[PDB]
Amino acid sequence: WEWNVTWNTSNPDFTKCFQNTVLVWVPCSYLWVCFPFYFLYLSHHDRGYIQMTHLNKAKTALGFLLWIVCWADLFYSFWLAPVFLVSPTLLGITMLLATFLIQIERRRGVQSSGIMLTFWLIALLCALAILRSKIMTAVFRDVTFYIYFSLVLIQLVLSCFSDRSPNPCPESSASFLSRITFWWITGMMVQGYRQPLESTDLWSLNKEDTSEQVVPVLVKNWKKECAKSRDPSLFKVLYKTFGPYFLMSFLFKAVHDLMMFAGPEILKLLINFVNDKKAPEWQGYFYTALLFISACLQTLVLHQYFHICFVSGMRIKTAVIGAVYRKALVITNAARKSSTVGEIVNLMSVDAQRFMDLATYINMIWSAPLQVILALYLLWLNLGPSVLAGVAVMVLMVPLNAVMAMKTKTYQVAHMKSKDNRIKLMNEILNGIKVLKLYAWELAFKDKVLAIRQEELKVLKKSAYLAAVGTFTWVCTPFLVALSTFAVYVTVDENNILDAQKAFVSLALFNILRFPLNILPMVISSIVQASVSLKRLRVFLSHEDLDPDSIQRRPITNSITVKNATFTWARNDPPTLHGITFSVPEGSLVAVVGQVGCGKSSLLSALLAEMDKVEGHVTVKGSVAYVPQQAWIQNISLRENILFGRQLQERYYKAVVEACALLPDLEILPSGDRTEIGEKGVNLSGGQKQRVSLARAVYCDSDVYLLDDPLSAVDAHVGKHIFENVIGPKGLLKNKTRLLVTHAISYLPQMDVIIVMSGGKISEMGSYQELLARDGAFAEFLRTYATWKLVEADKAQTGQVKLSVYWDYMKAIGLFISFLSIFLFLCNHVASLVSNYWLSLWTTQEHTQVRLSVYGALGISQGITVFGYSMAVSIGGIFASRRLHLDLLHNVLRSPISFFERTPSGNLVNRFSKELDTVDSMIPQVIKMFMGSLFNVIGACIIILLATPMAAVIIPPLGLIYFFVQRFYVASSRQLKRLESVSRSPVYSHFNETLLGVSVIRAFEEQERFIRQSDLKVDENQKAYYPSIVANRWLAVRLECVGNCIVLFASLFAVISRHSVGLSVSYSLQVTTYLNWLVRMSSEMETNIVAVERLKEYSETEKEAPWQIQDMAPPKDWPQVGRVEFRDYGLRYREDLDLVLKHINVTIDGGEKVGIVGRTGAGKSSLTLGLFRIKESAEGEIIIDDINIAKIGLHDLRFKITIIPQDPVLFSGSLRMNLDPFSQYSDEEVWTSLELAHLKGFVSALPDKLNHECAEGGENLSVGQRQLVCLARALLRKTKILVLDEATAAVDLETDDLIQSTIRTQFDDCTVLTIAHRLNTIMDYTRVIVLDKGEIQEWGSPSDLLQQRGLFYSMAKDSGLV
């Protein structure tokens, strides 16, 4: 090796020894270092074995022949030079390793080899170099090399084709080149250009990324971790699960850094050749070719690294969602109260996003130091032994930034904890929107949600401040280090030789150092956010687990054999069931009776292993079917609700439908048992829900039935019919154990055992006959008798996002920030341009100091502007997020009830949880980066145009070739993002539906089907998400290669056309980067803008009538008498179907108690909706005290009309907040109301009294005590209209009489419209007006109706009052 023949001569020729040693050691060596490592992948990853094909054999045979040929050389050498022995043998054995490798790759099922193609490629290049040398030299050993080269070339061509496999994703069957270039997606891309993509174009999900193939691994690893540590660390299981696939990203990142650092060196060498005519031209071309191949390989390896990181993040998100769902289905009640529904919704919505953000930057926590250390070491041997001073700066800056970052972790904890409270509050708002709108409590909760949002948005401002200050130090680090090391370098010794050339090199290198330190703030912020989101996930996954071994669920004497067990709702709270002991024989109908909050329902929940056992033995035998007190209904057709995971059996299904009085219900529905039933059963009535919930349990034939009051909402006749045909001894369940919890006693004589439970312990136990002779606590009670698809789905828009969206976001940000931020951007970029100009243009130690001072001033000015615009962008983004949340909340609240009926409660959760996450976090940073890239591009174009008049006809084409591909990419990226969000919404819907009814699912042992449904929905979401990232890589690969094809032309021109412009080579290198970056950023912003678009989607939806009308204002004492009078009133349930009320005309007098009563599906709960303007009246006019209701607003009417809703619902927070959320009543007033509603005897014993912490939706209370709270609210309001929408249904007889007496006493001067199914209360009323089929039938006093022997007489006959 000497420079005369290898570099100095115009003939590019390697030396003979170099040819025979290094050129042969390179390829053989590559396979030797990769071979061992490759077994890891070949072993850990398997796909079967490929069959015997001609291609595989062709490759194997050529591998055998190639080895022979190489050993044939050793034979001829055996037949002086030392290299003529070792080299042929080494090549033969590495060749024997190559053929063995394709063999094992066949065995392990790999169609395209990631090593063979590269191995042959490198071998080919080495052979090409020797080939050219051997053909320039000119039989004996040359012909062996020609045979070797031809065989290697054919082997390389063969290795490109993909072998046979052992609407799927093409990634599995794509060839190596297609996989490395992401070619296989281009079809979708061009498809997205023809017409917008739909969900059907989105391909299927790979088997490796599927939910059922990812979640079980993490779940098993978590069980192992939580079993070894009898507290476990979530980090250990997380990396043990997601490390083997991620280490490839580490390898690719190392290669990308080692190849990127070569780029500037090759550029510098090229710019010295072009600026020199004393070097053989061949050297210049070689430089351009080397730069081109280096840039191409750099982009390929970088984009492989990025794809691996993104895929790992996607898998992490899928695993996190699956594990959260499984734990939520497994969680216990106490932990469920501790870990609110907002916490779970945040865990599978914003937390995984933090993990995928961490996935991109975790690989940089070693790359950035590595680059910094490499640059510092190279400067050590470039400038001298004075760079250590710069080290001191890192020792005086890093700790500060670390201390500052540590404060952010205590600032993100409150940010991610004040988000769960808001999400929980909005979940309770959406679950009980009907009551929250019937009580006019809209702004009472609108001004309450904007009290946890502004607590969550303030810590965001503080964290943004700490992030801007943290990036300030990183942006000023280089210049400060330069100043410190130069101040030391001059004094470190007599080395004051800061010559322009040296100073120039050091300054350019220190500028290069800016790239590793410009990504550190994002890495640190992502690490902090991921640790904050890791703590919460570890806490949630470490909660207490329900124990199904507490109750011996023996399969199949006595079905239930409770043995003095003392159950409790939570570990620390005092027990609720004390010393319960009973034994129910098989088939014996048992009726639990007592009072409100006595433990009747708690007993069934304790027999379901849903309630903690202090001690005792329970042996409920068989399969248990549960009918909850509040019916649980999903969003499917009524037929599937009845089936509930069972195949249809006409013989049984028809009998079940007939028995539970469902034929009358399956005749008024639009299409019988094929109509969409709504998310929460809103399509059904209050009594039909109970019948459907009972039919679901009856169809699922079990051995033990725990009926928690299944006849608490149906009228007397239908209840009798159901009991006789289902629950009685002559029904379908005549040979099944039935714990029929009942409040109103009518079938007690037909009971077998009557459990009288009071206080919490079984106070009495015996049949009807054995309880009439006790003459005690309970005997005196008996003596005294006390198709269209209604729910739609989120639909993506087709086309470009309207600028209106951009305009609304800009208006949300404001004007002052929209100009100050732009000014800071522009000033920063112009300062950078001048710093680059001066360092370059200006390239006398009096000048050296001046140059150093001005450079430091420019760097500090750049840092100041960077910090300033980061602050401005963060503040503007927070302002925009606040405004957007306010607008979205107002739009949701102002929407009518029908909107909530047709929109599933997973779209709203999506807008308020995930889209808001994007608006707060991703959009500001994306806008900042896009603005920076755009301004950089404009500045670079300007500086080229000003300093090069010739380069004026290339700017328009260069802009066009990038604008066209930008459009071609965004046209599909927008639709991919839209489908991602649309497919995501269902997941939230399913999570809410499951979390609502966990108890029923556990009781029916039907967890697997719901787990599979959640897996399917998450699979659809990831099917929508994966093409987005794949298209991201495709766009970048094409752009970074298209721009890289240009620099090649510039380099060649600079070289080939110089004697007959050294700047263009670097200009193309510099500008193309800005152009590509800019394009990417634009697309990114566009995609994120989609989120804002969806937040706007609810604005155009038609809303309710104006809440307050100032022109039409009622007097303060407007309801003087409450003379309700319906004139021609007809209400239509939905616009398509027919009228539900046909020309009713009713004249109610002031203060006259009305007792509206009718059969099921008679439109009883239509006057209640109409009187509150819940649904606009197609025709008719309700007039209260001479003023039409339709003319007044809404809040005026709502506040002044009291209602007791059919479904008792208690919002989260304190018990007081469920009474006066406006805080308009004193403590004494509320306490008087409590004793008025007969609840003071329960709240007093509570340790927190009035401020007791209610659970999510009120499960902390009973169902009768939740109705007593509604009665307390009605007493507190105390208004002259008291429509009772089927109230007092879930309370015992004596409590019913007590609250009836309270209503009769304190509400004897109001126009109360008591809709009820218990006719005994309606008997002592002034008008018992009857509705039958939407038309008026009876009109008069109850006595007149009874004597008329009409419909009401038959109704009186059915109940048992005649």
Ligand SMILES: Nc1ncnc2c1ncn2[C@@H]1O[C@H](COP(=O)(O)OP(=O)(O)OP(=O)(O)O)[C@@H](O)[C@H]1O
């Ligand atoms: N989810 C819960 N968390 C905590 N305590 C609860 C919960 N559910 C019930 N309790 C406690 O158990 C008591 C009894 O409730 P339960 O609903 O069993 O009474 P009940 O008499 O069957 O009610 P109802 O008359 O409405 O049928 C409540 O008053 C409350 O103290």
Ligand SMILES: [Mg+2]
């Ligand atoms: Mg109950």
